[PDB]
Design goal:
It is classed as metal binding protein. The structure is a homodimer. By secondary structure, chain A is mainly alpha-helical. The first copy, chain A, has ten helices and two strands. The structure holds calcium ion (7 copies).
Amino acid sequence: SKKNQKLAEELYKTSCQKHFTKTEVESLIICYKNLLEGLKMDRNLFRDILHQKFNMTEDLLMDRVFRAFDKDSDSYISLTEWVEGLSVFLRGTLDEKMEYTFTVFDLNGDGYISREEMFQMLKTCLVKQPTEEDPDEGIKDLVEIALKKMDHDHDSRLSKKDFKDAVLIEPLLLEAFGKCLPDEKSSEIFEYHVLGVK
Amino acid sequence: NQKLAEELYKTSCQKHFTKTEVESLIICYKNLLEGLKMDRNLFRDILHQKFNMTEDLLMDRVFRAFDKDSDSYISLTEWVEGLSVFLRGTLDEKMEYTFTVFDLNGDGYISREEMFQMLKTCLVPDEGIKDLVEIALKKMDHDHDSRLSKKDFKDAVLIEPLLLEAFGKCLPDEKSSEIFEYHVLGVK
Ligand SMILES: [Ca+2]
Ligand SMILES: [Ca+2]
Ligand SMILES: [Ca+2]
Ligand SMILES: [Ca+2]
Ligand SMILES: [Ca+2]
Ligand SMILES: [Ca+2]
Ligand SMILES: [Ca+2]
């Protein structure tokens, strides 16, 4: 409490998160500590949290969300990564969110969401829960629809500019390639129970 | 006149135009009219020439959605209300409209066959369409009855955006919209 208030003062000061108050940071620190199994928040713990708290169930996208959280790529979510991540994930502006979803969707980190990446991401839900018949021609149709709507220069990939321009025009395209933000009900429940909002 | 525009702005359910814009739409309608009323043939030519729709099935369904009283003419009020949704519609307005277009028999469920015929006409081969239909049901059919109820469809909004772009071809593309608003309403 003294422990956590002083930690919260320091993290509120140092963290780049833009949306929690210092008291909310303290609640987030306590929550993190209460969720820890071992000393560090690893992939498997973070996966469980996404599944249980945010109803995400699909392996590829959960891994991509983890990687976006894990800013320094050490395969652990630090306290400051937990706050900063959740700040965007729960409260981000469109701008923040578009940068986040682009990062999720750019599977190899080369700066472009490629046709191939689109196909992998769109197919991954049907790998998990298959239709009776192979769905690949229909996925390819969706990929072409995406490219038609979003690829300005017809090079079969979306630059950051391609994606953000299109999402600003149609914000429903924010998560075009899969669910990587919490639905409104999940978000509300976590805010209410963990942060006391509403 | 102006009086029609005063009356229509007061009376109409359209949500997105100003009274001056309404007046512009009334003048537009009258500038385009060929006889006394806008019938299906004229309405189809407008969809074809100004909004880049090419297929008979699609154009018939858009007509029927604009023709709310099913009298086979597009009244001034229908033209304005339909264009309000069509050019500036909210998500809810657009989903309602797209559901209307796709639910061919008007029973309140999009069936597999309705979805296949309408995706096919919207996206003008069949292998991808047949897949799309199975994908949509797998993703959106909550109660597993092989049909999309209106709730099935509307709950799917924030969950399935690219699938909703497929269905959204009954609305005009951004390019066609912009050009019409620019010419007729004086917008960017
Ligand atoms: Ca880390
Ligand atoms: Ca990439
Ligand atoms: Ca197939
Ligand atoms: Ca491009
Ligand atoms: Ca009528
Ligand atoms: Ca039906
Ligand atoms: Ca159903």
